Amino acid sequence: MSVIRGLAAVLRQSDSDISAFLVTAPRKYKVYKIPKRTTGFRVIAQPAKGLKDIQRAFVQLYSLPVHDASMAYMKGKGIRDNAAAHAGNQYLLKADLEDFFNSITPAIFWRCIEMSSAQTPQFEPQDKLFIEKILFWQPIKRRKTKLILSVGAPSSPVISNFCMYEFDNRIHAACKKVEITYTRYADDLTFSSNIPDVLKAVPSTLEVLLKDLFGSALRLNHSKTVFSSKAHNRHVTGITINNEETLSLGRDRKRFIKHLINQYKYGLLDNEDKAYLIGLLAFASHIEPSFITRMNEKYSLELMERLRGQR
Amino acid sequence: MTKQYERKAKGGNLLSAFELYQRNSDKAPGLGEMLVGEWFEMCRDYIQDGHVDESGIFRPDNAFYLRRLTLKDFRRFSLLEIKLEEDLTVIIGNNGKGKTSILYAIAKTLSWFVANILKEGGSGQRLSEMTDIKNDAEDRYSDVSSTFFFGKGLKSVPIRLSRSALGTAERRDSEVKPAKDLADIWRVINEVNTINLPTFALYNVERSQPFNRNIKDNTGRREERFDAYSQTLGGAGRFDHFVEWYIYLHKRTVSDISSRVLTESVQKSIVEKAICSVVPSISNIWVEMITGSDLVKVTNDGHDVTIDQLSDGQRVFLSLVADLARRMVMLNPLLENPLEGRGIVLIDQIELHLHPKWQQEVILNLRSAFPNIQFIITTHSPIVLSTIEKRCIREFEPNDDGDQSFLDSPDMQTKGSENAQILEQ
Amino acid sequence: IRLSRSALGTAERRDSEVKPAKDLADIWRVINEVNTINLPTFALYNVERSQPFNRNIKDNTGRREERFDAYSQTLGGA
Amino acid sequence: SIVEKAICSVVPSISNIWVEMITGSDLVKVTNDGHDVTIDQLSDGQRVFLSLVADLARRMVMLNPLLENPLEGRGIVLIDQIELHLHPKWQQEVILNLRSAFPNIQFIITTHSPIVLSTIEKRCIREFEPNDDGDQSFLDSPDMQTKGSENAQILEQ
RNA sequence: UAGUCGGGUGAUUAGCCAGACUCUAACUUAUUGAACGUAUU
Numbered sequence A: 001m002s003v004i005r006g007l008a009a010v011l012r013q014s015d016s017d018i019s020a021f022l023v024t025a026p027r028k029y030k031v032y033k034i035p036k037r038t039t040g041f042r043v044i045a046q047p048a049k050g051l052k053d054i055q056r057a058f059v060q061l062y063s064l065p066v067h068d069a070s071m072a073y074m075k076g077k078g079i080r081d082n083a084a085a086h087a088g089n090q091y092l093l094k095a096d097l098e099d100f101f102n103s104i105t106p107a108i109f110w111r112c113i114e115m116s117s118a119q120t121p122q123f124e125p126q127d128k129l130f131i132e133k134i135l136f137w138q139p140i141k142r143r144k145t146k147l148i149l150s151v152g153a154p155s156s157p158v159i160s161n162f163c164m165y166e167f168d169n170r171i172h173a174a175c176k177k178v179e180i181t182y183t184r185y186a187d188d189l190t191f192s193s194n195i196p197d198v199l200k201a202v203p204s205t206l207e208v209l210l211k212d213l214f215g216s217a218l219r220l221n222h223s224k225t226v227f228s229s230k231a232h233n234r235h236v237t238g239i240t241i242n243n244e245e246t247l248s249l250g251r252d253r254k255r256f257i258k259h260l261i262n263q264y265k266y267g268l269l270d271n272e273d274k275a276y277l278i279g280l281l282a283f284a285s286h287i288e289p290s291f292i293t294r295m296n297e298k299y300s301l302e303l304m305e306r307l308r309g310q311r
Numbered sequence B: 001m002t003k004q005y006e007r008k009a010k011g012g013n014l015l016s017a018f019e020l021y022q023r024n025s026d027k028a029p030g031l032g033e034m035l036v037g038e039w040f041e042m043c044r045d046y047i048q049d050g051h052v053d054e055s056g057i058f059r060p061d062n063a064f065y066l067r068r069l070t071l072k073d074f075r076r077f078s079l080l081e082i083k084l085e086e087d088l089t090v091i092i093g094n095n096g097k098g099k100t101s102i103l104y105a106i107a108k109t110l111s112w113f114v115a116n117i118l119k120e121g122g123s124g125q126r127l128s129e130m131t132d133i134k135n136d137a138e139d140r141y142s143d144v145s146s147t148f149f150f151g152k153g154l155k156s157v158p159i160r161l162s163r164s165a166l167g168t169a170e171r172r173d174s175e176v177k178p179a180k181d182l183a184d185i186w187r188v189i190n191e192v193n194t195i196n197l198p199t200f201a202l203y204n205v206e207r208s209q210p211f212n213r214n215i216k217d218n219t220g221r222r223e224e225r226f227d228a229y230s231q232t233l234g235g236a237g238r239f240d241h242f243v244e245w246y247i248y249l250h251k252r253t254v255s256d257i258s259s260r261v262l263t264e265s266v267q268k269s270i271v272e273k274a275i276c277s278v279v280p281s282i283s284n285i286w287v288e289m290i291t292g293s294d295l296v297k298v299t300n301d302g303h304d305v306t307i308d309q310l311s312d313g314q315r316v317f318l319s320l321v322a323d324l325a326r327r328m329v330m331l332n333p334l335l336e337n338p339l340e341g342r343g344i345v346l347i348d349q350i351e352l353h354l355h356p357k358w359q360q361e362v363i364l365n366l367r368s369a370f371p372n373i374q375f376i377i378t379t380h381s382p383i384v385l386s387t388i389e390k391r392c393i394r395e396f397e398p399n400d401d402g403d404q405s406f407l408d409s410p411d412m413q414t415k416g417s418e419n420a421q422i423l424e425q
Numbered sequence C: 001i002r003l004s005r006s007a008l009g010t011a012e013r014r015d016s017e018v019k020p021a022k023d024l025a026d027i028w029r030v031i032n033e034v035n036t037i038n039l040p041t042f043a044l045y046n047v048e049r050s051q052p053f054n055r056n057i058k059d060n061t062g063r064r065e066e067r068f069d070a071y072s073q074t075l076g077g078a
Numbered sequence D: 001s002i003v004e005k006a007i008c009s010v011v012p013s014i015s016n017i018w019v020e021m022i023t024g025s026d027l028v029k030v031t032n033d034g035h036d037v038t039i040d041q042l043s044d045g046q047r048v049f050l051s052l053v054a055d056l057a058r059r060m061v062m063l064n065p066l067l068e069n070p071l072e073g074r075g076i077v078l079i080d081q082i083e084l085h086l087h088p089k090w091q092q093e094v095i096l097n098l099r100s101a102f103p104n105i106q107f108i109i110t111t112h113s114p115i116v117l118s119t120i121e122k123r124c125i126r127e128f129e130p131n132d133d134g135d136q137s138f139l140d141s142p143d144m145q146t147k148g149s150e151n152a153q154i155l156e157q
Numbered sequence E: 001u002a003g004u005c006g007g008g009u010g011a012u013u014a015g016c017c018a019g020a021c022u023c024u025a026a027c028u029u030a031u032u033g034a035a036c037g038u039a040u041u
């Protein structure tokens, strides 16, 4: 029985039990609200433990094609690589997608399966109903035909990465010929070039390609299409790009960290803010290693050693 | 959580500070306070802080204006983007190029700010599903995206107004939450401690209708502070409301004898000075109570005449200036000069009914009277453009079909240039 | 049922709670639509009741015979 | 057909006007620069001029049934601020179009623009002097030939 | 000139000092999930 047989082999459970579980599985989500950083809330639906294990086993079993321009949910690749792809460049065209994860329906996933340019696992027609139960979330209890991908599920990142394999391939192919580098952190397309007046023609290409591939289901967020250059602030997915073509945390965050270290110097920092500063300095060491050396010079090596890791 | 909000708020974030204030207030005898004295004080100081520059004009520390507008399948525009200036933006072009459409979209966006200032969760105006969607659009929906700036602590306030065409199964929602949040901040802070409120006004072609003093039982109370938001984006400023308010001020001043000085007299004097300074022909305005119906009289070219004997052009401009001055005075009680309050004012065809002599100074007078107001104006005249900087002008190409992405400034400096040159180029 | 109103500019909005009355009237309307039932009569007679007759009377035939015309202007005062 | 020809030949943007049945109801649609918007989608500049021309043409058509061209009929038409809501491009041809559509009508208009005056003969202009308190007893024509002159010259002199 | 970048000082998210940039043109975001860094291990 193909997919269910493999899931039983990996999960050490009977095929019948797994098949019985994957009947109301799209309804097996607990939805909760996480706070936004400024104001409001974000609705996240997280599957139950059993469905989570099923999704993890499924994604480990079947490897879908992903593009090298995708820097999100990839092993060995992350925020720093995405920012450093455009570290040496002058103009940039940060763009966004409109409700990316919730716009991926089973129809989109199955359509992208059959027209993929790369190798795709062969799925029997018997297990195509079970795949939808495994992967997709069913947000309205009365409507059973509304299935969407939910951010917060283990399977959703790789499914969303694969659903834009062809989009990434076509965009990269059409974009490298005009000397523009392209990346995507799974919802946030980044373009940059050293040639002026070439990025202004990119959003139309993105719109027409999205219409060609996903039809009306997936679309750009026209309010989130931002042009920038060295005359203005330049940041890619959280990392500020300096006018010296180097990655940085920004002046404001680096002064915030300096204030935190100065507070810790005089014992004005409690346990929670101390842990927050140790976490932020680990992140700063990852992104901008020279900041750690500069803080060692400014606040002495002994104080930093007492705060940061000792062993 | 609490600590992230505290870290953002102490860094200058207005939204986080307001969130902290509301939460801490909730616990009346618990953690927090009434003026949270940290969070409420920071919010009110953010809204109220400012300094007088070298020219004697009060400048708010965190200015409020509209940064960007995107129009998607709205009227004739497939996808248009504008980069309005902080102080003055002038949109020019041929007839039927979409300037009035842009002003209409901006007014529809500002109606949500006005509605949520007036009421909690109030609903503003919405795009029409019969005439606002582009006729030959394939998608059958329209978007009007905007971004507002309210200082470094609130750099982006995105609001999107959307409407699907009539008889379309799939409807499009509007993202109006950030405007509601900003107006909630304004209203809640104002309730606890009075603060200066922004002025949003639209002056369409719908103005310049005849004016007769037919407004007696007009239901609403013109002294009430929040009457300055009533019909303020309808297109025709309520000049009858101004007449009632002015007569009320005159009555309170003539019937009177913290410093035993009436603030109504100060408001009346400020409005009088504004009207006399902006309108060229009008030299002095007052209220006559003998011949015992109340009458407003102005001095036109040295002749005392009544308010309904003004010409079309001295009465329309007077109505605009008087309405704007009244709303600014009522919405800025803590300012030494209430006309220096902030806000967004849209004027359609500013040269309407005006002689070329008056067009040479309308923009300068308007900007001198209201220095912190962001004016977004359309015009059909080289004379008005000769008094306006090149960077403030957004021109439509003469061969546009609506598929232009970004409106631009002309390549020729218009300020101080001859009228023939501006006409030709 | 509560009919609430708040002044302009108040930090919190005061709204009505007309849901139970709406539920009772929904019961009335739905039951009547399925099978005819007797309906309540709400009327208000103010001082404006004393108005002169107008003799010649609009021949707006067609709406005075419908059953739900008994709710037309029934709380206007006259 | 007469009204259609009058409307299309005077309003620069209107190419064709016709009545279409939409959802049963009848509505009027016009052609603006190759697009087929309806009347209430017109701008304040095209709609006002269209209403003026259409009203005048309808009045002439009803009042002149014995003429092969009803627009060539007698009458007196007063227009206040003829250039209202009009771009300077349209002001260069607002007088010629009106006087070619309505040849026998005496037009008495007021204007605030020199672009309109550039298309009008000097003999047809009555000007109020800038220093006029109302005691003067004659409205006089300018002392420059405004027809065919520069914008700057008409604006200055 | 703005605006932006950020090396230093600063009981330090503020203020100041030096330096630099300018396609019409950043607006700093989201967990418990995924990956990254770090710590136990």
Ligand SMILES: Nc1ncnc2c1ncn2[C@@H]1O[C@H](COP(=O)(O)OP(=O)(O)O)[C@@H](O)[C@H]1O
Pocket (backbone or CB within 6 Å): B074, B075, B076, B093, B094, B095, B096, B097, B098, B099, B100, B101, B102, B131, B132, B133, B134, B135, B136, B378, D032, D035, D037, D041, D042, D043, D044, D045
């Ligand atoms: N729904 C629509 N679809 C297509 N074109 C439209 C639509 N609504 C309006 N238009 C066009 O847009 C223009 C509207 O004019 P307007 O915005 O008032 O311009 P202006 O300020 O230059 O007078 C007209 O040319 C009209 O034909």
